[PDB]
Design an enzyme around this catalytic site. Structure first.
Site, PDB file in Angstrom:
ATOM      1  CG  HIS A   1     -10.183  -6.972  -4.407  1.00  0.00           C
ATOM      2  ND1 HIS A   1      -9.345  -6.186  -3.663  1.00  0.00           N
ATOM      3  CD2 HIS A   1     -11.323  -7.118  -3.681  1.00  0.00           C
ATOM      4  CE1 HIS A   1      -9.936  -5.896  -2.498  1.00  0.00           C
ATOM      5  NE2 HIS A   1     -11.136  -6.445  -2.514  1.00  0.00           N
TER       6      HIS A   1
ATOM      7  CG  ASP B   1      -4.194  -0.972  -3.859  1.00  0.00           C
ATOM      8  OD1 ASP B   1      -4.706   0.041  -4.391  1.00  0.00           O
ATOM      9  OD2 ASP B   1      -4.881  -1.852  -3.279  1.00  0.00           O
TER      10      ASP B   1
ATOM     11  CD  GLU C   1      -4.984  -3.188  -6.699  1.00  0.00           C
ATOM     12  OE1 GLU C   1      -4.152  -3.983  -7.197  1.00  0.00           O
ATOM     13  OE2 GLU C   1      -5.775  -3.511  -5.767  1.00  0.00           O
TER      14      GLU C   1
ATOM     15  CG  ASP D   1     -14.146  -9.029  -4.791  1.00  0.00           C
ATOM     16  OD1 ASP D   1     -14.602 -10.166  -4.850  1.00  0.00           O
ATOM     17  OD2 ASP D   1     -13.768  -8.535  -3.705  1.00  0.00           O
TER      18      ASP D   1
ATOM     19  CE  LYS E   1      -4.113  -0.948   2.503  1.00  0.00           C
ATOM     20  NZ  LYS E   1      -4.824  -1.820   1.526  1.00  0.00           N
TER      21      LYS E   1
ATOM     22  CD  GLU F   1      -9.132  -2.965  -4.303  1.00  0.00           C
ATOM     23  OE1 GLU F   1      -9.877  -2.497  -3.414  1.00  0.00           O
ATOM     24  OE2 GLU F   1      -7.904  -3.097  -4.162  1.00  0.00           O
TER      25      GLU F   1
END
Ligand code: MG
Ligand code: MG
Lengths: 352, 367
Positions: A289, A187, A213, A262, A158, A239
């Site tokens: 995801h 991400d 991401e 997802d 992240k 996501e």
């Protein structure tokens, strides 16, 4: 009728992490007694809302219907809650039902999901990410070494602190540790602006970052396009896209290199295929995801993208935790969706 | 803090309809659903907002509010309606970006605005824009199954109720039927009454084109949701091949979605609904956006709250919805020479007759 839907039962579990995530099970019983369970999940919010919708809005409408006509039931659900639909809570709920139908369809036909969704492979590239933003730097790297020795050749971290420089630091730290060959993804969880993102992708092009991401708000398809046009790191999102249209928009305008639908929140395995069929047309890698247990059957089915191995131990409360053979997620050959909850273990977390 | 949030109480009601109402995509309608949300402060202050549905989603809206949003709100300053609304978006984001989430957020935000009014002593129409306290209006009917005679008699009632504009549903399998009922309504109301249509996203692009062509001759002021509100490009194609102006908005739950419309849909009229696009704060954010694209700000449902809002911007129309929420309010909608009259009491201009709707409360229960 043999396959007619007789009963449907939906349970909500609050399961702890390391603070807690939600799991929603939905079990469909048929006429001949066959059962199938599907599910969806949450980072802690809307579990009640999803179960309320299922139990008042959708389920009583579904009793009587033929479970084999899944596209039919899917379509029916989409219009039935449309006023309060077009994404949001409504799509989680829909997924839960659709997956259980796919599950019955698997057990009914004696086929595992990975063959049902197209059967191009039974194995797939995987990669680990964590809820690692708040983590001290050494703690992060010790974690990533963990992943590398569990058997994974790709990791993800992240990014997105108000202190931008701290982020370029942690990205360089990780690339040092893993060397030239291990895959790296970042991400941002839509915390950046377009110009903030372009700053960052420029600053780390040098570290062989495989994708960026959700750099900015996922609702900003032009935004992404602005980013990608000022950038040399491939853009990734999915996501939070809940509607085949929202995916339609993403292909049309977002200039993505990797897309991550997802199944739990874009309308189950029927929706997921809608998304993946679309993404494939645009010659783009089909990634996923969350929900590793399920998705391994889906990524492997299209054989083209990465299976995300998410923090949530949804797989720790099932019969078969994710199985890795050299740097690759392996899918179950057991008929159904290849997922089967350990009821006795989660029973302590059920709520209301 | 004297205007910290104390306790927030939310109620569900299943309120029945005098009769069954049908349209092309929502099937049937024997009741609507009301959600009331009362925010209380550290100085006894009480504001109340609401949202509604066509019978589905009420429990799901109450659930989300009761567990996901309400507790996180307590102990904030009800004055900071910008911050509390910005907060709710990110808080439920994972299960948000529209749908049930924005219904939820709307009830709460409208409460905060009822407080802002009562606390500032201002009526909504001044707060929301000020540019007017009266506004154009039209009667909608969810009337697609009504035989031709009933539809007309029912329309004959809207005119006699002091209205100068009406709308009817279309979407029948047989397109011809919808043509013949439009021709009829025009022949009954004469040239001077404004006339709209609404297909509830039930037609293919091709169908909307054929239909719009065969009826442009009856002077149709707009063509509401001819096709899926997610097919913006679809709206473009329809608009590029027809004359009657396109309208949409009642199914758009996000500031981004209105953006998409203005960018692409080529709309002549847009219809934000405060009940489900982020309450009064979101409605304004979208009204402002609709304004800059030089489009008349109209409105769907919830006549008793919108009358303030359409007046305030003074550019579009107010729908007189078929869910008579205003009848369970203390102030039923007020019409003067074909115009809607915005309440002048401080707040949102809405205060429910709790005694009347009390008999209609639902309560969760247990499975
Ligand atoms: Mg992400
Ligand atoms: Mg409409």
């Amino acid at each position: 009728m043999k396959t007619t839907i007789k009963d449907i039962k939906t349970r909500l579990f609050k399961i702890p992490l390391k603070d807690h995530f939600e799991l929603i099970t939905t079990t469909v019983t048929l006429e001949d007694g066959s059962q199938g369970t599907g599910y969806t999940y949450t980072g802690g919010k809307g579990g009640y809302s999803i179960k309320a919708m299922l139990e008042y809005d959708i389920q009583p409408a579904l009793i009587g219907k033929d479970a084999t006509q899944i596209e039919e039931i899917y379509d029916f659900m989409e219009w039935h809650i449309h006023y309060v639909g077009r994404g949001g809570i409504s799509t989680f709920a829909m997924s839960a039902v659709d997956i259980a139908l796919w599950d019955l369809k698997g057990k009914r036909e004696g086929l595992p999901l990975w063959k049902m969704a197209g059967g191009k492979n039974n194995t797939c590239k995987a990669y680990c990410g964590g809820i690692d933003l708040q983590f001290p730097l050494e703690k992060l790297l010790n974690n990533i070494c963990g992943y590398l020795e569990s058997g994974f050749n790709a990791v993800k971290i992240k990014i997105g602190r108000e202190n931008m420089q701290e982020d370029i630091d942690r990205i360089k730290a990780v690339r040092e540790l893993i060397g030239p060959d291990i895959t790296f993804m970042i991400d941002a969880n839509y915390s950046l602006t377009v110009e903030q993102a372009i700053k960052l992708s420029k600053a780390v092009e040098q570290y062989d970052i495989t994708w960026f991401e959700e750099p900015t708000l996922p609702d900003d398809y032009k935004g992404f396009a602005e980013i990608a046009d000022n950038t040399a790191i491939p853009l990734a999102m999915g996501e939070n896209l809940h509607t085949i249209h929202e995916f339609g928009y993403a292909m049309d305008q977002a200039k993505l290199g990797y897309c991550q639908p997802d199944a739990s929140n874009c309308g189950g395995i029927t929706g997921w295929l809608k998304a993946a069929d679309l993404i494939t047309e645009h010659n783009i890698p089909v990634c996923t995801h969350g929900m590793q247990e399920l998705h391994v059957s889906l990524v492997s089915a299209f054989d083209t993208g990465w299976l995300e191995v998410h923090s949530f131990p949804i797989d720790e409360y099932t019969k078969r935790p994710l199985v890795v053979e050299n740097f690759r997620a392996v899918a179950s050959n057991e008929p159904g969706i290849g997922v089967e909850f350990d009821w006795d273990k989660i029973a302590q977390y059920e709520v209301h």
